Amino acid sequence: EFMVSLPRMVYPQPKVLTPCRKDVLVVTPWLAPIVWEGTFNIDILNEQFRLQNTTIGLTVFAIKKYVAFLKLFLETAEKHFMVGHRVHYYVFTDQPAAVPRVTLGTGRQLSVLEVRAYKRWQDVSMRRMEMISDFCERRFLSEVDYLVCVDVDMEFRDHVGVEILTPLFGTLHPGFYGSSREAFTYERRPQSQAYIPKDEGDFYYGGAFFGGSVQEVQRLTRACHQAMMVDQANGIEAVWHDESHLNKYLLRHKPTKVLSPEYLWDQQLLGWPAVLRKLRFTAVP
């Protein structure tokens, strides 16, 4: 929509002849920014998004025993996720009375959406695509500008803000950002909808953190669900489930921003490398 003028702001001048990072790739070959610390001035971005009255939805599934993760998830989201902006949390659970009472900042609200629990963890994980797509029909189009879709067994430890927002984003999986594409754990069986040949692939995106505009998230989640249903009719389940399908989708429909592994990390397994200036969203050990 129509965008008013930014106010006067004083900040350091961008330096054309100085790279903003000398150690990492900060733009994809299709000219999508790769979001690392040092690539953005959050003061400028916060102005741009506040002037558009941006509302961010954050979807999270807490099914069966994973309700235990919600307290820390939501408490740390309150400290670090889109602070200053309008936020709507959507907690999908089979136990709607077991969502913890977390105190929310002003302009932030939470809705609990009851869903069925599948028996296998694989199905719980995979059926998020259907459940998100179903909810894009009603709630999300009327309530938010962007959707952010994450795993619950996680905590925010540092800023996750409007720098991530764009029509469609994925996040670099922390186990593969330095790997060659042949080592990526894409689905490699041609019988699956998620099949990616050994000579294709840009990145290995993590299934635990993706998002975009409601329109683009509806598209992604619908496509992944329909692909899963084809596989199921054919008696095949992708090797890494929803993540496999997400990877196939983002190969053929390129994201408009890619998040660095700052945004999806596991310190227990991978430590704190020099290349990560901040660890923003991390696995609970």
Ligand X SMILES: CC(=O)N[C@H]1[C@@H](OP(=O)(O)OP(=O)(O)OC[C@H]2O[C@@H](n3ccc(=O)[nH]c3=O)[C@H](O)[C@@H]2O)O[C@H](CO)[C@H](O)[C@@H]1O
Q: Of the ranges 27-35, 63-71, 138-146, 219-227, which one interacts with ligand X (CB under 6 A)?
A: 63-71
Q: How far is the CB of 42 from its own copies (least distance, A)?
A: 9
In this structure, the number of other CB atoms found within 10 A of the CB of residue 199 comes to: 7
In this structure, the number of other CB atoms found within 10 A of the CB of residue 276 comes to: 20
Which does residue 102 bind out of ligand X, its own copies, none, counting CB within 5 to 8 angstroms by kind?
Answer: none
Size of the site for ligand X (CB under 6 A): 11
Is 284 annotated as a binding-site member? no
- Of 21, 33, 48, 64, the one binding ligand X by CB under 6 A: 64
Within positions 43 to 62, which residues make up the interface with ligand X, using CB under 6 A?
61-62
Is 62 annotated as a binding-site member? yes
Is 117 annotated as a binding-site member? no
Which does residue 153 bind out of its own copies, ligand X, none, counting CB within 5 to 8 angstroms by kind?
Answer: ligand X
User: Which CB, 50 or 71, lies closer to ligand X?
Assistant: 71
User: Which CB, 29 or 235, lies closer to its own copies?
Assistant: 29
Q: Of the ranges 32-40, 108-116, 120-128, 227-235, which one interacts with ligand X (CB under 6 A)?
A: 120-128
- CA separation (Å) from 105 to 21, 51, 85, 143, 246? 34, 20, 10, 18, 32
Within positions 185 to 224, which residues make up the interface with ligand X, using CB under 6 A?
none
Is 187 annotated as a binding-site member? no
Give the span between the Cα atoms of 96 and 88, in whole angstroms: 17
User: Which CB, 26 or 239, lies closer to ligand X?
Assistant: 239
Residues with active-site annotation: 243
Give the span between the Cα atoms of 238 and 277, in whole angstroms: 34
For the record, the structure tokens of 265 come out as 């990390």
Within positions 154 to 193, which residues make up the interface with its own copies, using CB under 8 A?
163, 172, 177-178, 180-181
For position 51 contacting its own copies by CB under 8 A, the verdict is no
Footprint of its own copies on this chain (CB under 8 A)? 3, 5-6, 8-11, 13-31, 33-35, 39-41, 44-45, 48, 163, 172, 177-178, 180-181, 197, 199-203, 251-254, 257, 275
Q: Where on the chain is the footprint of ligand X (CB under 6 A)?
A: 61-64, 66, 121, 124-125, 151-153
